[PDB]
Scaffold this active site. Structure first.
Site, PDB file in Angstrom:
ATOM      1  N   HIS A 314       0.844  -1.209   0.000  1.00 36.79           N
ATOM      2  CA  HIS A 314       0.000   0.000   0.000  1.00 36.79           C
ATOM      3  C   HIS A 314       0.876   1.255   0.000  1.00 36.79           C
ATOM      4  CE1 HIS A 314      -3.985   1.950   0.546  1.00 36.79           C
ATOM      5  NE2 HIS A 314      -3.226   2.919   1.023  1.00 36.79           N
ATOM      6  N   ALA A 315       0.697   2.115  -1.007  1.00 38.01           N
ATOM      7  CA  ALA A 315       1.624   3.232  -1.267  1.00 38.01           C
ATOM      8  C   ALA A 315       1.821   4.175  -0.084  1.00 38.01           C
ATOM      9  CB  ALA A 315       1.180   4.031  -2.488  1.00 38.01           C
ATOM     10  N   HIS A 344       0.174  11.702  -6.351  1.00 41.99           N
ATOM     11  CA  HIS A 344      -0.309  11.789  -4.968  1.00 41.99           C
ATOM     12  C   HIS A 344       0.849  11.635  -3.979  1.00 41.99           C
ATOM     13  CE1 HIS A 344      -3.112  11.428  -1.554  1.00 41.99           C
ATOM     14  NE2 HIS A 344      -2.254  10.522  -1.114  1.00 41.99           N
ATOM     15  N   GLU A 345       1.650  10.589  -4.170  1.00 38.43           N
ATOM     16  CA  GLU A 345       2.767  10.315  -3.253  1.00 38.43           C
ATOM     17  C   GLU A 345       3.850  11.395  -3.352  1.00 38.43           C
ATOM     18  OE1 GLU A 345       2.019   8.142  -1.133  1.00 38.43           O
ATOM     19  OE2 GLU A 345       0.368   7.244  -2.286  1.00 38.43           O
ATOM     20  N   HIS A 348       3.202  14.338  -1.100  1.00 37.59           N
ATOM     21  CA  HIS A 348       3.659  14.232   0.291  1.00 37.59           C
ATOM     22  C   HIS A 348       5.148  14.530   0.363  1.00 37.59           C
ATOM     23  CE1 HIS A 348      -0.043  12.623   1.836  1.00 37.59           C
ATOM     24  NE2 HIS A 348       0.036  11.495   1.151  1.00 37.59           N
ATOM     25  N   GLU A 372      -2.645  15.523   1.949  1.00 36.99           N
ATOM     26  CA  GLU A 372      -3.219  14.615   0.964  1.00 36.99           C
ATOM     27  C   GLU A 372      -3.545  15.314  -0.360  1.00 36.99           C
ATOM     28  OE1 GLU A 372      -3.029  11.533   1.496  1.00 36.99           O
ATOM     29  OE2 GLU A 372      -2.540  11.684   3.641  1.00 36.99           O
ATOM     30  N   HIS A 474      -6.595   1.084   5.705  1.00 37.28           N
ATOM     31  CA  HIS A 474      -6.492   2.114   6.751  1.00 37.28           C
ATOM     32  C   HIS A 474      -7.036   1.691   8.094  1.00 37.28           C
ATOM     33  CE1 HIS A 474      -6.047   3.990   2.910  1.00 37.28           C
ATOM     34  NE2 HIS A 474      -5.493   5.044   3.487  1.00 37.28           N
ATOM     35  N   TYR A 484      -8.925  12.378   3.692  1.00 32.09           N
ATOM     36  CA  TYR A 484      -9.211  12.205   2.262  1.00 32.09           C
ATOM     37  C   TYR A 484     -10.499  12.869   1.781  1.00 32.09           C
ATOM     38  CZ  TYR A 484      -5.562   8.679   2.919  1.00 32.09           C
ATOM     39  OH  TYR A 484      -4.399   8.012   3.232  1.00 32.09           O
TER      40      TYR A 484
HETATM   41  O1  LIG Z   1       2.176   8.270   2.992  1.00 30.95           O
HETATM   42  C1  LIG Z   1       1.218   8.745   3.622  1.00 30.95           C
HETATM   43  N1  LIG Z   1      -0.004   8.209   3.529  1.00 30.95           N
HETATM   44  C2  LIG Z   1      -0.312   7.011   2.734  1.00 30.95           C
HETATM   45  C3  LIG Z   1      -1.183   6.092   3.615  1.00 30.95           C
HETATM   46  C4  LIG Z   1      -0.451   5.663   4.761  1.00 30.95           C
HETATM   47  C5  LIG Z   1      -0.423   6.425   5.947  1.00 30.95           C
HETATM   48  C6  LIG Z   1       0.323   6.003   7.057  1.00 30.95           C
HETATM   49  C7  LIG Z   1       1.036   4.795   7.000  1.00 30.95           C
HETATM   50  C8  LIG Z   1       1.019   4.034   5.823  1.00 30.95           C
HETATM   51  C9  LIG Z   1       0.284   4.477   4.716  1.00 30.95           C
HETATM   52  P1  LIG Z   1      -1.149   7.659   1.247  1.00 30.95           P
HETATM   53  O2  LIG Z   1      -2.375   8.386   1.657  1.00 30.95           O
HETATM   54  O3  LIG Z   1      -0.139   8.447   0.502  1.00 30.95           O
HETATM   55  C10 LIG Z   1      -1.562   6.244   0.240  1.00 30.95           C
HETATM   56  C11 LIG Z   1      -2.722   6.565  -0.699  1.00 30.95           C
HETATM   57  C12 LIG Z   1      -2.631   5.576  -1.885  1.00 30.95           C
HETATM   58  C13 LIG Z   1      -3.546   5.973  -3.055  1.00 30.95           C
HETATM   59  C14 LIG Z   1      -4.331   5.137  -3.771  1.00 30.95           C
HETATM   60  C15 LIG Z   1      -4.975   5.875  -4.688  1.00 30.95           C
HETATM   61  C16 LIG Z   1      -5.836   5.458  -5.650  1.00 30.95           C
HETATM   62  C17 LIG Z   1      -6.584   6.401  -6.370  1.00 30.95           C
HETATM   63  C18 LIG Z   1      -7.454   5.998  -7.393  1.00 30.95           C
HETATM   64  C19 LIG Z   1      -7.572   4.641  -7.718  1.00 30.95           C
HETATM   65  C20 LIG Z   1      -6.817   3.693  -7.020  1.00 30.95           C
HETATM   66  C21 LIG Z   1      -5.951   4.107  -5.997  1.00 30.95           C
HETATM   67  N2  LIG Z   1      -4.611   7.147  -4.582  1.00 30.95           N
HETATM   68  O4  LIG Z   1      -3.665   7.250  -3.500  1.00 30.95           O
HETATM   69  C22 LIG Z   1      -4.024   6.273   0.041  1.00 30.95           C
HETATM   70  O5  LIG Z   1      -4.055   5.538   1.033  1.00 30.95           O
HETATM   71  N3  LIG Z   1      -5.106   6.852  -0.487  1.00 30.95           N
HETATM   72  C23 LIG Z   1      -6.433   6.586   0.053  1.00 30.95           C
HETATM   73  C24 LIG Z   1      -7.445   7.646  -0.417  1.00 30.95           C
HETATM   74  C25 LIG Z   1      -7.371   8.183  -1.704  1.00 30.95           C
HETATM   75  C26 LIG Z   1      -6.504   9.255  -1.980  1.00 30.95           C
HETATM   76  C27 LIG Z   1      -6.458   9.811  -3.263  1.00 30.95           C
HETATM   77  C28 LIG Z   1      -7.283   9.314  -4.272  1.00 30.95           C
HETATM   78  O6  LIG Z   1      -7.246   9.866  -5.527  1.00 30.95           O
HETATM   79  C29 LIG Z   1      -8.154   8.251  -3.999  1.00 30.95           C
HETATM   80  C30 LIG Z   1      -8.205   7.692  -2.713  1.00 30.95           C
HETATM   81  C31 LIG Z   1      -6.875   5.160  -0.372  1.00 30.95           C
HETATM   82  O7  LIG Z   1      -6.095   4.485  -1.103  1.00 30.95           O
HETATM   83  O8  LIG Z   1      -7.960   4.753   0.077  1.00 30.95           O
HETATM   84  O9  LIG Z   1       1.348   9.829   4.424  1.00 30.95           O
HETATM   85  C32 LIG Z   1       2.624  10.523   4.444  1.00 30.95           C
HETATM   86  C33 LIG Z   1       2.563  11.535   5.442  1.00 30.95           C
HETATM   87  C34 LIG Z   1       1.534  12.480   5.432  1.00 30.95           C
HETATM   88  C35 LIG Z   1       1.474  13.480   6.415  1.00 30.95           C
HETATM   89  C36 LIG Z   1       2.440  13.539   7.412  1.00 30.95           C
HETATM   90  C37 LIG Z   1       3.471  12.600   7.423  1.00 30.95           C
HETATM   91  C38 LIG Z   1       3.528  11.597   6.448  1.00 30.95           C
HETATM   92 ZN   LIG Z   2      -1.611  10.333   0.856  1.00 27.51          ZN
END
Ligand SMILES: O=C(N[C@@H](Cc1ccccc1)P(=O)(O)C[C@@H](Cc1cc(-c2ccccc2)no1)C(=O)N[C@@H](Cc1ccc(O)cc1)C(=O)O)OCc1ccccc1
Ligand SMILES: [Zn+2]
Ligand SMILES: *[C@@H]1O[C@H](CO[C@@H]2O[C@@H](C)[C@@H](O)[C@@H](O)[C@@H]2O)[C@@H](O[C@@H]2O[C@H](CO)[C@@H](O)[C@H](O)[C@H]2NC(C)=O)[C@H](O)[C@H]1NC(C)=O
Ligand SMILES: *[C@@H]1O[C@H](CO)[C@@H](O)[C@H](O)[C@H]1NC(C)=O
Ligand SMILES: [Cl-]
Ligand SMILES: [Cl-]
Length: 586
Positions: A314-315, A344-345, A348, A372, A474, A484
């Site tokens: 998980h990214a 997205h990544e 951050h 985010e 999550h 989000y």
């Molecule tokens: O790395 C993270 N956070 C990650 C999660 C996490 C947090 C803590 C520990 C481990 C991991 P993510 O949200 O980047 C990881 C990302 C991944 C991801 C997936 C997709 C996706 C969009 C469309 C289709 C298919 C997929 N987009 O982004 C995440 O979960 N996103 C949520 C919500 C989301 C976000 C954007 C989006 O377009 C769609 C959905 C999810 O996957 O459910 O945070 C870093 C940080 C932030 C703030 C302070 C310190 C550090």
């Molecule tokens: Zn994120």
């Protein structure tokens, strides 16, 4: 007095850098190589950081915060007074850390197997099935199997997790863990503000839902889709039905205006995970924002290892509290979806680099939604047909109102559909945390919200022992979700503001901020504030006003709202799911 307080924060900052850097190293090593040994080292490094948090947190609480002049000092100290899990007694802290490890490991190593056949992992195998299969039974196999294997396995841990996270929260002066999480926004009106925003997106969501439901009726059959009921949760192209654009093929407004196969295009043109991240890097620097350092390319994990070794796919984006070392860990697949994820990544990462010179206590987003949103804002511009054509991933789509409605639909399937999902996840968890939902009712109340907010139903009735929330990353990873929902609202406010600063005129959805130094400067000034000021100040720096507001998102999608109302009216759709008790017969 004031002198002892600034000395304390100076000492906290030096020592925290070292300890958080060590902790991040061990956490990274486990995430990128799940083994007994790395697990062992991580749990031990958890003791080290908890030791440090306790020493400084204890000292911080001895300061009476409101006898202190300087607000920045005042702010750091009040923040250090929250020990988080390190408030727990030794025995409970040990147990809690093990529970977290076991939940995240269980989720990331779960597989779903064909009897005497191959076993599928979530990424990329099950993700692909959900995205591309158009066969009801095969989608059901993946949807149910994932819940059976990941969700059910998390249940054993969750009640104790809730107990211990709540206990820590109470020990830090909160009433429960959900209270603690909401406090991250420093916004008393938070719940009311989020409810209002949700309600504003109702016309668009209900119209999108009705239109998609009709299209699913056409494909999967009258006997399987109730035109006045909730949609079966396995048919939206995504494991959690949280974003729907993978079923674009089933719902295209004008099939006479086809789009290039972007996956095919990226594959044929030799795109790789490295290239995807370089393209994102280029967009950031085109805005006058910071390039990732050479070390990022050396140390990041940008695809799933072929070593056979096990990872958390998980990214995520990693700050090593060095001011130097920043990394992404993503099991990147070569497609447009993961190109957007990469952005997205990289968002951050940009934030980490922008606030690197602040005290570590203030190295956070203005609020978690800001962190985010950054990557998603740039991705909105990357996603435009004009920009995608410039990358050779689409052909010329311009002018044509047909391609224009198609593009808006493609975007709505993700940006609009995600609104009720992102809203409900922590509606559920807040009520778990406050004791409103017990372990007897976890799953039932999850589906009640799935129905109420998204108008979805499970394709197979749930049974005792199911814990469908555990099948969403999550939840077992204990990562707050409301960020989000906030992100999806504010990223459109940012897009609108950056576009006007970039001098773009006409429909908001046609805007591409590529190369705008004006847009870049607004984002940079906001990001540099980190967590040093109330978030409305960063909102003001970007948008010229201090509120969260749905108006920008509504404006982006206005032409699609009009199109959907006309389409839905001509077909006689009943908006919503008045037959809310409907569940699949077969
Ligand atoms: O790395 C993270 N956070 C990650 C999660 C996490 C947090 C803590 C520990 C481990 C991991 P993510 O949200 O980047 C990881 C990302 C991944 C991801 C997936 C997709 C996706 C969009 C469309 C289709 C298919 C997929 N987009 O982004 C995440 O979960 N996103 C949520 C919500 C989301 C976000 C954007 C989006 O377009 C769609 C959905 C999810 O996957 O459910 O945070 C870093 C940080 C932030 C703030 C302070 C310190 C550090
Ligand atoms: Zn994120
Ligand atoms: C309130 O204090 C902040 C923080 O001061 C810094 O950190 C302290 C622990 C101590 O080490 C100080 O000597 C540091 O300067 C002040 O903010 C800084 O101000 C300087 C000078 O304008 C600026 O260059 C820094 O970037 C600021 N640092 C941060 C972290 O914001 C601030 O000036 C003080 N406020 C008032 C009204 O005096
Ligand atoms: C995985 O972890 C082990 C220790 O458990 C270590 O010896 C090995 O080198 C690691 N593998 C990689 C590829 O880093
Ligand atoms: Cl679910
Ligand atoms: Cl959050």
């Amino acid at each position: 007095d004031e002198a002892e307080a600034s000395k304390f924060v100076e000492e906290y900052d030096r020592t925290s850098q070292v300890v958080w850097n060590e902790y991040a190293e061990a956490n990274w090593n486990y995430n990128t190589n799940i083994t007994t040994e790395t697990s062992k080292i991580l749990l031990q490094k958890n003791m080290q950081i908890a030791n440090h948090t306790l020493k400084y947190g204890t000292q911080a609480r001895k300061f009476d915060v409101n006898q202190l002049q300087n607000t920045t000092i005042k702010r750091i100290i009040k923040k250090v007074q929250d020990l988080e899990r390190a408030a727990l007694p030794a025995q409970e802290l040990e147990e809690y850390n093990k529970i977290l490890l076991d939940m995240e490991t269980t989720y990331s190593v779960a597989t779903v197997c064909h009897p005497n056949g191959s076993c599928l992992q979530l990424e990329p195998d099950l993700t692909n099935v959900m995205a591309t299969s158009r066969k009801y039974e095969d989608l059901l196999w993946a949807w149910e199997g994932w819940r059976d294997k990941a969700g059910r396995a998390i249940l054993q841990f969750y009640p104790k997790y809730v107990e211990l996270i709540n206990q820590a929260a109470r020990l830090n002066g909160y009433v429960d863990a959900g209270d603690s999480w909401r406090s991250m926004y420093e916004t008393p009106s938070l719940e009311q503000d989020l409810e209002r925003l949700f309600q504003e997106l109702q016309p668009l969501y209900l119209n999108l839902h009705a239109y998609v439901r009709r299209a699913l009726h056409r494909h999967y059959g009258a006997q399987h889709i109730n035109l006045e009921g909730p949609i079966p949760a396995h048919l939206l192209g995504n494991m959690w039905a949280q974003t729907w654009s993978n079923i674009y093929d089933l719902v295209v407004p004008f099939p006479s205006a086809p789009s290039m196969d972007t996956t095919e295009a990226m594959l044929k043109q030799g795109w790789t995970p490295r290239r995807m991240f370089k393209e994102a890097d280029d967009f950031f620097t085109s805005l006058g924002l910071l390039p990732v350092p050479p070390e990022f390319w050396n140390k990041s994990m940008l695809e799933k290892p072929t070593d056979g070794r096990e990872v958390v796919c998980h990214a995520s984006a990693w700050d090593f509290y060095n001011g130097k070392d920043f990394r992404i860990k993503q099991c990147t697949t070569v497609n447009l979806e993961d190109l957007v994820v990469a952005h997205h990544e990289m968002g951050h990462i940009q934030y980490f680099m922008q606030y690197k010179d602040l005290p570590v206590a203030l190295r956070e987003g203005a609020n978690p939604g800001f962190h985010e949103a950054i990557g998603d804002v740039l991705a909105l511009s990357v996603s435009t047909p004009k920009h995608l054509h410039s990358l050779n991933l689409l052909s010329s789509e311009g002018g044509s109102d047909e391609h224009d409605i198609n593009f808006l639909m493609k975007m709505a399937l993700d940006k609009i559909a995600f609104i009720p999902f992102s809203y409900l996840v922590d509606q559920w968890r807040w009520r778990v945390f406050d004791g409103s939902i017990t372990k007897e009712n976890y799953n039932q109340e999850w589906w009640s919200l799935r129905l109420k907010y998204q108008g979805l139903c499970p394709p197979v009735p749930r049974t005792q022992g199911d814990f469908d929330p555990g099948a969403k990353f999550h939840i077992p990873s204990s990562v707050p979700y409301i960020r989000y929902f906030v992100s999806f609202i504010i990223q459109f406010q940012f897009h609108e503001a950056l576009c006007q600063a970039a001098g773009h005129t006409g429909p908001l959805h046609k805007c591409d901020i590529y190369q705008s130094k004006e847009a870049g400067q607004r984002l940079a000034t906001a990001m540099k504030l980190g967590f040093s000021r109330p978030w409305p100040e960063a909102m003001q720096l970007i948008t010229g006003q201090p509120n969260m507001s749905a108006s920008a998102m509504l404006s982006y999608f206005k032409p699609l709202l009009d199109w959907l109302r006309t389409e839905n009216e001509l077909h006689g759709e009943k908006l919503g799911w008045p037959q809310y008790n409907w569940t699949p017969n077969s």
